[PDB]
């Protein structure tokens, strides 16, 4: 419930109260977001409140909205805070056009390729150095590639059940005979398209 | 006296009653020790350990023999016969993990921790080992109530009577030589910027469109730097107190013997000079504690509520005006200082007018 | 009181390795400077060489040029000193025998800029 | 000019707690000290028990020894429209008395001994 990296009690309750202000948290990142697009994701917090939280949702909510909320505060906040933060991240990824990844936000459990490497090493210049062997010092690998590889391993680990807005299910192309998700094969390409966009808003 | 059989069937937790009854330290000291461990007649019936022990009756006492050779107490038999259930049940509780603190290059332990011998364990030898463990239990609890409770650094006289309160400050003191009131305190910029942090966060989230991270950065950035917005928010926070002059606070002295050592004042003005780090106090309140400007650091606590500020009215600068020695006399703490009196002495006791003979002639 | 003005000399020391790494203050997005140079002025806030913890999965959130410039007052370890003060001396020690480099690339320019001069000075001092 | 100028001041609205709010290390990460000041000693709480009533002087210690009351005073400071002059911060209907950490520790240490400190008419 708490970590050994000691934080002051009293700063915890401030992040418990600022995480409920969804509209100010999404308008500090991008002010050109419609209010009904936030409300359609915000109405679904009453259904997923009795469910569990999985670390791929925490990673996708910690990556986005870092300009108005710290990522390290996610392990020191309650359930009603992370539900509103997942709804805010779902609305922020729905507005930006990344509909293939924003479905996996409010959900109940049942390296870098050559196309993006040149711009991902440009937007993230700080890379992780690797150990050489019999000389020949290899090029460093990107830490954001390790992060998106961990997110891709966390997404495809198990099957999923959608608990969210039906308009988001109708925007993206997913067929259904029951309420189970279908993971596409290009799901590693869209999240790398998100982080680069997350590079383009920050750098 | 608590029924030990009543506490071990109403636990409803993990229900691990067998701690020593199941383990045998067979490659279990790496798991059972660190994860778990890291009414005792021998306390009261301990007048028989001079050079001979009257408790050599080992097992199966069936205590009904009234052979009491003791001159200190006669109501001990009434204490026994009042509640006969004493060390009868089989379920004796284990102290929690919070009572024992285990790091660094050398594993440091404390000397009153001598209760781990019971965790490491013919009937005539096992029955002797149970009472050996019971005497070790008594020897542990007596020395833990003597060395960790009875001492002045301990749980009772240091932590059970309050220590290290929140929303507090400690700084040196100056005086206010101004036209002012008798209950006014001037908090400096560096003390007031950290004592009122969530108040500034609330005012910055209400008056401005800022998150709590940007508000925390704006608060912590302008501690050693003056700016107009934090000063205006301080003036607003002072002006928000409608029936009081400001925020109610308490002010202490480190030698606290008399009534005047603990007073209640009101924060009325935050200073603009960042180099001045001192709390400026009233002149008339300097006499009731023995407080001078000799480099002494004085403590201050902030009352959050209105009910707490109304309850702290019993300690006020007007409460020590009447003396506690004479029945009808105001005490000497109301007396003015040296340079306050000397100007009135030079003004009133001056050759100002001719005498009464020359005045009517 | 302007003629009675004492002088205070202070020394602040920090470490950054496998546990945690530095932050990018005192410069724009085209340079990296964890500390002011010798003969520079400290910022109006007293934060000098603030330290951020070492994580891997928070790379698009924390290891971005926007977050390296801003300072979080919580979940961090800064060093607060005097706002108006001139930097007099800088001493940098370095263990350079570890085969994995814990610090990422682009952050160890100003460190080795002092470390090479100190190593050359001590090398001449041992050579004499 | 002399030694001991005014620089050893302290101010802390919230201090880190023990895994009970004492910290002693290289504390130079904040402008000014952030340590809790022991303003309430034994003689101080004795004078606050005699002059102030015994009721409201236990709430000042219960707002520190209980972390829930320490969170509740910051919640009342951050949820009110006026940060100063708040009537009630910690109501005793949701967070009642009896959740002090050293008091419960002493009660547990005396309960493992086999006795209890209570009273009855």
mmCIF file of C-alpha atoms in Angstrom, chain A:
data_model
loop_
_atom_site.group_PDB
_atom_site.id
_atom_site.type_symbol
_atom_site.label_atom_id
_atom_site.label_comp_id
_atom_site.label_asym_id
_atom_site.label_seq_id
_atom_site.Cartn_x
_atom_site.Cartn_y
_atom_site.Cartn_z
ATOM 1 C CA UNK A 1 0.000 0.000 0.000
ATOM 2 C CA UNK A 2 3.118 2.168 0.237
ATOM 3 C CA UNK A 3 6.754 2.055 -0.851
ATOM 4 C CA UNK A 4 10.035 2.572 0.981
ATOM 5 C CA UNK A 5 10.717 5.711 -1.069
ATOM 6 C CA UNK A 6 9.244 7.832 1.708
ATOM 7 C CA UNK A 7 6.773 10.530 0.646
ATOM 8 C CA UNK A 8 5.125 13.002 3.004
ATOM 9 C CA UNK A 9 1.572 12.183 4.160
ATOM 10 C CA UNK A 10 -0.507 15.181 3.154
ATOM 11 C CA UNK A 11 0.745 15.314 -0.403
ATOM 12 C CA UNK A 12 -1.111 12.016 -0.918
ATOM 13 C CA UNK A 13 -4.545 13.516 -0.227
ATOM 14 C CA UNK A 14 -3.881 16.425 -2.609
ATOM 15 C CA UNK A 15 -3.436 13.990 -5.502
ATOM 16 C CA UNK A 16 -6.544 12.147 -4.293
ATOM 17 C CA UNK A 17 -8.541 15.369 -4.741
ATOM 18 C CA UNK A 18 -6.930 16.663 -7.939
ATOM 19 C CA UNK A 19 -7.439 13.344 -9.752
ATOM 20 C CA UNK A 20 -11.222 13.813 -9.510
ATOM 21 C CA UNK A 21 -10.987 17.055 -11.534
ATOM 22 C CA UNK A 22 -11.071 15.282 -14.890
ATOM 23 C CA UNK A 23 -11.898 18.277 -17.113
ATOM 24 C CA UNK A 24 -9.067 20.462 -15.797
ATOM 25 C CA UNK A 25 -6.674 17.506 -16.053
ATOM 26 C CA UNK A 26 -7.540 16.917 -19.719
ATOM 27 C CA UNK A 27 -7.676 20.619 -20.650
ATOM 28 C CA UNK A 28 -4.168 21.257 -19.309
ATOM 29 C CA UNK A 29 -2.844 18.758 -21.884
ATOM 30 C CA UNK A 30 -5.049 19.647 -24.862
ATOM 31 C CA UNK A 31 -7.654 22.399 -24.564
ATOM 32 C CA UNK A 32 -9.364 21.471 -27.863
ATOM 33 C CA UNK A 33 -11.246 18.477 -26.443
ATOM 34 C CA UNK A 34 -15.076 18.346 -26.465
ATOM 35 C CA UNK A 35 -16.789 18.023 -23.097
ATOM 36 C CA UNK A 36 -19.206 15.293 -24.220
ATOM 37 C CA UNK A 37 -16.238 13.197 -25.381
ATOM 38 C CA UNK A 38 -14.933 13.357 -21.805
ATOM 39 C CA UNK A 39 -18.388 12.672 -20.344
ATOM 40 C CA UNK A 40 -18.960 9.547 -22.468
ATOM 41 C CA UNK A 41 -15.819 8.029 -20.939
ATOM 42 C CA UNK A 42 -16.624 9.436 -17.483
ATOM 43 C CA UNK A 43 -20.043 7.752 -17.261
ATOM 44 C CA UNK A 44 -18.394 4.299 -17.381
ATOM 45 C CA UNK A 45 -16.574 4.647 -14.038
ATOM 46 C CA UNK A 46 -19.574 3.255 -12.123
ATOM 47 C CA UNK A 47 -19.314 -0.167 -13.797
ATOM 48 C CA UNK A 48 -15.537 -0.695 -13.570
ATOM 49 C CA UNK A 49 -15.398 0.451 -9.928
ATOM 50 C CA UNK A 50 -16.087 -3.092 -8.671
ATOM 51 C CA UNK A 51 -13.363 -4.599 -10.896
ATOM 52 C CA UNK A 52 -9.579 -4.916 -10.706
ATOM 53 C CA UNK A 53 -6.821 -2.685 -12.090
ATOM 54 C CA UNK A 54 -4.074 -4.215 -14.244
ATOM 55 C CA UNK A 55 -0.598 -2.722 -14.875
ATOM 56 C CA UNK A 56 -1.071 -2.164 -18.624
ATOM 57 C CA UNK A 57 -3.813 0.360 -17.802
ATOM 58 C CA UNK A 58 -1.539 1.954 -15.187
ATOM 59 C CA UNK A 59 1.272 2.159 -17.757
ATOM 60 C CA UNK A 60 -0.981 3.664 -20.443
ATOM 61 C CA UNK A 61 -2.292 6.212 -17.926
ATOM 62 C CA UNK A 62 1.202 6.990 -16.598
ATOM 63 C CA UNK A 63 2.594 7.601 -20.094
ATOM 64 C CA UNK A 64 -0.033 10.183 -21.086
ATOM 65 C CA UNK A 65 -1.009 13.295 -19.019
ATOM 66 C CA UNK A 66 2.415 13.671 -17.435
ATOM 67 C CA UNK A 67 2.239 17.434 -18.075
ATOM 68 C CA UNK A 68 -0.487 17.826 -15.421
ATOM 69 C CA UNK A 69 -0.124 14.746 -13.180
ATOM 70 C CA UNK A 70 3.012 12.921 -11.974
ATOM 71 C CA UNK A 71 3.464 9.306 -13.021
ATOM 72 C CA UNK A 72 5.050 8.216 -9.725
ATOM 73 C CA UNK A 73 1.908 9.233 -7.795
ATOM 74 C CA UNK A 74 -0.019 6.349 -9.405
ATOM 75 C CA UNK A 75 1.278 3.837 -6.833
ATOM 76 C CA UNK A 76 0.141 6.071 -3.939
ATOM 77 C CA UNK A 77 -3.495 6.809 -4.851
ATOM 78 C CA UNK A 78 -6.796 5.035 -4.293
ATOM 79 C CA UNK A 79 -9.260 3.263 -6.601
ATOM 80 C CA UNK A 80 -11.594 6.218 -7.224
ATOM 81 C CA UNK A 81 -8.576 8.239 -8.382
ATOM 82 C CA UNK A 82 -7.260 5.663 -10.857
ATOM 83 C CA UNK A 83 -10.754 5.078 -12.295
ATOM 84 C CA UNK A 84 -11.119 8.778 -13.146
ATOM 85 C CA UNK A 85 -7.532 8.838 -14.432
ATOM 86 C CA UNK A 86 -8.247 5.845 -16.690
ATOM 87 C CA UNK A 87 -11.384 7.594 -17.975
ATOM 88 C CA UNK A 88 -9.353 10.760 -18.622
ATOM 89 C CA UNK A 89 -6.643 8.797 -20.452
ATOM 90 C CA UNK A 90 -9.311 6.975 -22.487
ATOM 91 C CA UNK A 91 -10.851 10.298 -23.544
ATOM 92 C CA UNK A 92 -7.422 11.780 -24.338
ATOM 93 C CA UNK A 93 -6.494 8.775 -26.492
ATOM 94 C CA UNK A 94 -9.938 8.804 -28.129
ATOM 95 C CA UNK A 95 -9.554 12.446 -29.178
ATOM 96 C CA UNK A 96 -6.052 12.020 -30.643
ATOM 97 C CA UNK A 97 -7.176 9.311 -33.089
ATOM 98 C CA UNK A 98 -5.552 6.290 -31.401
ATOM 99 C CA UNK A 99 -8.768 4.285 -31.275
ATOM 100 C CA UNK A 100 -7.035 0.902 -31.641
ATOM 101 C CA UNK A 101 -5.312 1.230 -28.250
ATOM 102 C CA UNK A 102 -7.857 3.289 -26.233
ATOM 103 C CA UNK A 103 -10.301 0.353 -26.031
ATOM 104 C CA UNK A 104 -8.092 -1.441 -23.473
ATOM 105 C CA UNK A 105 -8.475 1.227 -20.755
ATOM 106 C CA UNK A 106 -11.629 0.228 -18.826
ATOM 107 C CA UNK A 107 -11.436 -3.556 -19.244
ATOM 108 C CA UNK A 108 -12.148 -6.613 -17.078
ATOM 109 C CA UNK A 109 -9.969 -9.728 -17.266
ATOM 110 C CA UNK A 110 -11.597 -12.825 -18.761
ATOM 111 C CA UNK A 111 13.414 -3.495 -30.111
ATOM 112 C CA UNK A 112 12.069 -0.890 -32.549
ATOM 113 C CA UNK A 113 11.380 -1.600 -36.219
ATOM 114 C CA UNK A 114 12.953 0.402 -39.040
ATOM 115 C CA UNK A 115 9.757 2.385 -39.750
ATOM 116 C CA UNK A 116 9.941 4.385 -36.496
ATOM 117 C CA UNK A 117 13.522 4.012 -35.201
ATOM 118 C CA UNK A 118 15.025 7.164 -36.751
ATOM 119 C CA UNK A 119 12.434 9.505 -35.225
ATOM 120 C CA UNK A 120 12.211 7.614 -31.901
ATOM 121 C CA UNK A 121 15.971 7.939 -31.411
ATOM 122 C CA UNK A 122 15.639 11.637 -32.286
ATOM 123 C CA UNK A 123 12.776 12.475 -29.908
ATOM 124 C CA UNK A 124 14.403 10.389 -27.131
ATOM 125 C CA UNK A 125 18.181 10.921 -27.344
ATOM 126 C CA UNK A 126 18.994 9.437 -23.914
ATOM 127 C CA UNK A 127 19.556 5.734 -24.602
ATOM 128 C CA UNK A 128 20.622 2.797 -22.441
ATOM 129 C CA UNK A 129 24.214 1.690 -22.996
ATOM 130 C CA UNK A 130 24.820 -2.039 -23.431
ATOM 131 C CA UNK A 131 27.750 -4.270 -22.527
ATOM 132 C CA UNK A 132 30.182 -5.074 -25.332
ATOM 133 C CA UNK A 133 31.756 -8.498 -25.872
ATOM 134 C CA UNK A 134 35.320 -9.162 -27.176
ATOM 135 C CA UNK A 135 35.556 -5.472 -27.980
ATOM 136 C CA UNK A 136 33.248 -4.089 -30.750
ATOM 137 C CA UNK A 137 31.166 -1.589 -28.695
ATOM 138 C CA UNK A 138 27.546 -1.933 -29.790
ATOM 139 C CA UNK A 139 25.129 0.955 -30.267
ATOM 140 C CA UNK A 140 22.922 1.771 -27.249
ATOM 141 C CA UNK A 141 19.322 0.596 -27.223
ATOM 142 C CA UNK A 142 16.385 2.947 -26.628
ATOM 143 C CA UNK A 143 14.650 2.763 -23.251
ATOM 144 C CA UNK A 144 11.306 3.799 -24.789
ATOM 145 C CA UNK A 145 11.523 0.723 -27.008
ATOM 146 C CA UNK A 146 11.888 -1.378 -23.856
ATOM 147 C CA UNK A 147 8.861 0.421 -22.383
ATOM 148 C CA UNK A 148 6.650 -0.176 -25.429
ATOM 149 C CA UNK A 149 7.877 -3.798 -25.582
ATOM 150 C CA UNK A 150 6.845 -4.260 -21.938
ATOM 151 C CA UNK A 151 3.464 -2.678 -22.721
ATOM 152 C CA UNK A 152 3.016 -4.968 -25.744
ATOM 153 C CA UNK A 153 3.883 -7.975 -23.575
ATOM 154 C CA UNK A 154 1.384 -6.785 -20.952
ATOM 155 C CA UNK A 155 -1.423 -6.317 -23.501
ATOM 156 C CA UNK A 156 -1.219 -9.734 -25.206
ATOM 157 C CA UNK A 157 -0.825 -11.688 -21.937
ATOM 158 C CA UNK A 158 -4.479 -12.710 -21.502
ATOM 159 C CA UNK A 159 -7.994 -12.302 -22.893
ATOM 160 C CA UNK A 160 -10.093 -9.228 -22.201
ATOM 161 C CA UNK A 161 -13.691 -8.055 -21.705
ATOM 162 C CA UNK A 162 -14.799 -4.569 -22.768
ATOM 163 C CA UNK A 163 -16.574 -2.349 -20.216
ATOM 164 C CA UNK A 164 -16.840 1.085 -21.812
ATOM 165 C CA UNK A 165 -18.654 3.309 -24.304
ATOM 166 C CA UNK A 166 -20.215 1.597 -27.306
ATOM 167 C CA UNK A 167 -19.269 4.565 -29.513
ATOM 168 C CA UNK A 168 -15.589 3.726 -28.997
ATOM 169 C CA UNK A 169 -16.393 0.110 -29.893
ATOM 170 C CA UNK A 170 -18.142 1.328 -33.058
ATOM 171 C CA UNK A 171 -15.334 3.715 -34.059
ATOM 172 C CA UNK A 172 -12.671 1.004 -34.152
ATOM 173 C CA UNK A 173 -13.343 -2.084 -36.270
ATOM 174 C CA UNK A 174 -13.887 -5.026 -33.919
ATOM 175 C CA UNK A 175 -16.341 -7.870 -34.482
ATOM 176 C CA UNK A 176 -18.161 -9.542 -31.592
ATOM 177 C CA UNK A 177 -20.260 -12.616 -30.952
ATOM 178 C CA UNK A 178 -19.720 -12.139 -27.206
ATOM 179 C CA UNK A 179 -18.114 -9.468 -25.014
ATOM 180 C CA UNK A 180 -14.499 -10.552 -25.604
ATOM 181 C CA UNK A 181 -11.752 -8.461 -27.213
ATOM 182 C CA UNK A 182 -9.729 -9.299 -30.320
ATOM 183 C CA UNK A 183 -6.089 -8.155 -30.323
ATOM 184 C CA UNK A 184 -4.905 -7.006 -33.776
ATOM 185 C CA UNK A 185 -1.503 -7.845 -35.213
ATOM 186 C CA UNK A 186 -0.544 -4.182 -35.769
ATOM 187 C CA UNK A 187 -1.038 -3.300 -32.081
ATOM 188 C CA UNK A 188 2.723 -2.804 -31.671
ATOM 189 C CA UNK A 189 2.689 -0.181 -34.441
ATOM 190 C CA UNK A 190 -0.021 2.077 -32.999
ATOM 191 C CA UNK A 191 1.449 2.469 -29.484
ATOM 192 C CA UNK A 192 4.808 3.402 -31.010
ATOM 193 C CA UNK A 193 2.803 5.936 -33.021
ATOM 194 C CA UNK A 194 1.417 7.210 -29.701
ATOM 195 C CA UNK A 195 4.756 7.641 -27.884
ATOM 196 C CA UNK A 196 6.193 9.568 -30.853
ATOM 197 C CA UNK A 197 3.107 11.783 -30.578
ATOM 198 C CA UNK A 198 3.906 11.931 -26.858
ATOM 199 C CA UNK A 199 7.352 13.017 -28.004
ATOM 200 C CA UNK A 200 5.845 15.649 -30.292
ATOM 201 C CA UNK A 201 3.804 17.276 -27.510
ATOM 202 C CA UNK A 202 6.712 17.373 -25.025
ATOM 203 C CA UNK A 203 9.915 17.863 -27.041
#
